[PDB]
Amino acid sequence: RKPKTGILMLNMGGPETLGDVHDFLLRLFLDRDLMTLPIQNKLAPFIAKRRTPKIQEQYRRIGGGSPIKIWTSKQGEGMVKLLDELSPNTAPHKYYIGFRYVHPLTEEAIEEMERDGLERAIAFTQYPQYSCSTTGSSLNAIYRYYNQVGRKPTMKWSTIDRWPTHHLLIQCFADHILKELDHFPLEKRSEVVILFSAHSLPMSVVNRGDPYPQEVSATVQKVMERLEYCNPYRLVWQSKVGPMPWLGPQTDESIKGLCERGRKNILLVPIAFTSDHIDTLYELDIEYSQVLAKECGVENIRRAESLNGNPLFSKALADLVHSHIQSNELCSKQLTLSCPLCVNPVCRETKSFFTSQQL
Amino acid sequence: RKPKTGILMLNMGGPETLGDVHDFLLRLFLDRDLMTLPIQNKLAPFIAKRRTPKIQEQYRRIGGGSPIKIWTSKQGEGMVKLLDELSPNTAPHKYYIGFRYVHPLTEEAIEEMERDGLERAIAFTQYPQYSCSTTGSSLNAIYRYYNQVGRKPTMKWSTIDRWPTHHLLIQCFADHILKELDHFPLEKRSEVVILFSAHSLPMSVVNRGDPYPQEVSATVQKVMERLEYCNPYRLVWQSKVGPMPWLGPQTDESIKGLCERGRKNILLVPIAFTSDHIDTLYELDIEYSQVLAKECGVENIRRAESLNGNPLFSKALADLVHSHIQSNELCSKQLTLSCPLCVNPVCRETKSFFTSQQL
Ligand SMILES: C=CC1=C(C)c2cc3[nH]c(cc4nc(cc5[nH]c(cc1n2)c(C)c5C=C)C(C)=C4CCC(=O)O)c(CCC(=O)O)c3C
Ligand SMILES: C[C@H](CCC(=O)O)[C@H]1CC[C@H]2[C@@H]3[C@H](O)C[C@@H]4C[C@H](O)CC[C@]4(C)[C@H]3C[C@H](O)[C@]12C
Ligand SMILES: C[C@H](CCC(=O)O)[C@H]1CC[C@H]2[C@@H]3[C@H](O)C[C@@H]4C[C@H](O)CC[C@]4(C)[C@H]3C[C@H](O)[C@]12C
Ligand SMILES: C[C@H](CCC(=O)O)[C@H]1CC[C@H]2[C@@H]3[C@H](O)C[C@@H]4C[C@H](O)CC[C@]4(C)[C@H]3C[C@H](O)[C@]12C
Ligand code: FES
Ligand code: FES
């Protein structure tokens, strides 16, 4: 039976093989929204050519590529299974992957959705916490696709642009934290200090009103409440690159710091993303828990499992979508407010594309 | 009946009159908890004599000095009435005011509590969101005192060192917001944008590990939940001074930004303090809502009323203590963890002072 309701799962994406590395850097650097380069159409391809080795090396050290497609899919399948059962008048459901910077590209997936002749399309970001650099960008990609192509959308669109405190999302996190706690030696369970590590931002983006830091902060608190404050915590930020100021403290600096001060049992909890990817498999597990931790005198260091294939995250996804359909919401109230200091003419356009949709 | 339990309400303070402005600044600049100035004992007396006229002129602009004590007092009487009826086991309850930089000073308050022969002393911060510049500084004073004085405490000690999301505190902010939304023209209510405005911290404090941003953000979220996201929002930060980098967006920049983008209806909600003080009556109500937004084209800017005399906030305060007392805790789990990049030797000592009280 032909697909009625499409769910576009948005994520930035990662290179699947080492061969996909160059074209991933290229799209990243060609993007005027993300970075502003002099002679951008000449520099981007050369900067990418030069950075490819450094980055292949990173995927090399985790086994040759990203797994976000495998997990994103596995999540998709469970979601659809559930929804067709939760919501028959909107069945059958299909999921589509819209990676921002690798195949299948956002623009490629939208192309398929229209082709399948769906009635309703739901843009569903896989970042629980909104940032203009992530979700903002995927949403812009959609507006741009229909502007680019110069035709109207043949489906009734909407978005779940954020959901940083979803009750089941909160649960999956708590369960993974708890069960990982049970893996620390009993004589240190109480001593365990928790570091919620989220992808950092450049200060210039923060200072502009990006809604991310407040939302990631919102999530941490909700999880800690469910844990009944069983251990102390901190929210720290990973992934700074280059000399400019970014939001702190730095996940690494914070690891070293605590070690120097005798807090040698650190559990790392990846709160800003739902699946494994480079930020956990290389940055946290290798460059931090392996080396760093070795040269700082660490005792135990562990990393709560990413949600990945946990069936409860499946439920979370179906629940969100289901409720979103039950509410007739077109986008969060939050999306209707662009960052107070936003330059970038397109943000308004996108916000209008979503609030203006038919029905 | 002599007092049994003593409730030390901690807060930074503000000059009660134009004449108190000098000593207030002199005491801020002498704090090794906040300012590392060369030859500090000589610099601060100068840097005060110098800044004093600027600061006086501000208080003038708001009637003549700080309302902090008037509100702290009242809030305190209400809390005690209720406590005596909620927890009669703790016998008569007395409230003491410990301001950090004006009389009655924490030091003075501790003397008075001592020579009252209380059985129990509670260090209650009047800052729901913990920062090492606010609550920490108050707590360091409690320790520093009993250490300098050579004696040891003659009464059981403990702290409610934080409470960013206490449900009655949430009810109060939401209640004032709703009330303030009824003062906008009907036709503009849904178009009202909310800015929660918290006193900012310098980036170096944020980057060092400070709890504040994550907690403030927690509060914002709970408050917006209760309001069921009726209007869009951002969390923004006020009161930057000097040339160094601070956590933004600056609140002023945000007002002016929203305004330039045609979001010309704004409701300021001070979310990190529980009374009027200089930051609201001058900064927000006068430099921002009067001078600034007038020359920017603003249609309506209001400010949610500070918690002040709200009887329900009194209940909140009593509610926090009754629970603190019944649960027997000495402090939060969060206090038992210092900033990962903390460089201040007293933070260890102060934590110990609380984690290790008898009973
Ligand atoms: C390290 C982090 C912080 C530093 C270094 C800090 C420094 C200051 N705080 C001041 C005043 C103040 N700070 C105040 C509440 C806070 N202050 C806070 C965080 C900081 N405040 C937080 C968090 C607050 C509560 C939310 C208030 C209410 C005043 C009143 C100052 C005045 O003019 O009376 C002044 C006056 C300086 C001047 O010359 O104008 C300085 C320098
Ligand atoms: C670090 C990297 C150069 C890689 C290398 O020399 O190995 C450069 C090239 C493009 C840069 C990015 C772009 O300048 C855009 C961003 C602008 C912000 O103010 C800094 C971070 C920001 C996200 C940059 C981070 C980093 O410096 C990048 C990624
Ligand atoms: C891959 C490259 C690092 C190159 C280097 O270390 O030399 C980095 C530098 C800035 C990065 C970007 C910034 O972190 C901003 C975005 C943050 C998201 O978590 C991923 C996509 C996101 C768009 C990043 C893509 C990619 O990881 C970039 C472009
Ligand atoms: C600008 C003013 C001095 C002006 C004068 O001498 O007349 C100075 C005096 C003490 C300063 C503070 C001290 O330098 C200590 C802090 C150091 C941080 O890097 C910035 C905030 C910080 C809290 C400063 C803010 C601001 O620059 C202050 C308030
Ligand atoms: S940059 Fe955030 S809305 Fe445009
Ligand atoms: S500065 Fe935060 S604990 Fe010392």
CSV table of C-alpha atoms in Angstrom, one decimal, chain B residues 10 21 25 30 33 55 149 152 175 190 199 207 232 255 276 281 324:
chain,number,residue,atom,x,y,z
B,10,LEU,CA,22.3,35.2,52.1
B,21,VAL,CA,27.8,53.6,48.2
B,25,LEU,CA,32.5,49.3,46.6
B,30,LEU,CA,38.9,43.9,48.6
B,33,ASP,CA,37.2,35.8,45.8
B,55,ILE,CA,27.3,54.5,41.1
B,149,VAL,CA,38.0,33.9,64.7
B,152,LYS,CA,34.7,26.7,66.3
B,175,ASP,CA,2.2,34.0,37.8
B,190,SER,CA,0.6,36.7,21.1
B,199,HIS,CA,23.2,39.0,35.4
B,207,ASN,CA,35.1,28.7,31.2
B,232,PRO,CA,8.6,32.6,22.2
B,255,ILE,CA,16.3,44.3,22.9
B,276,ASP,CA,14.1,44.7,42.9
B,281,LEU,CA,15.1,49.5,38.7
B,324,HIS,CA,15.8,20.9,54.0
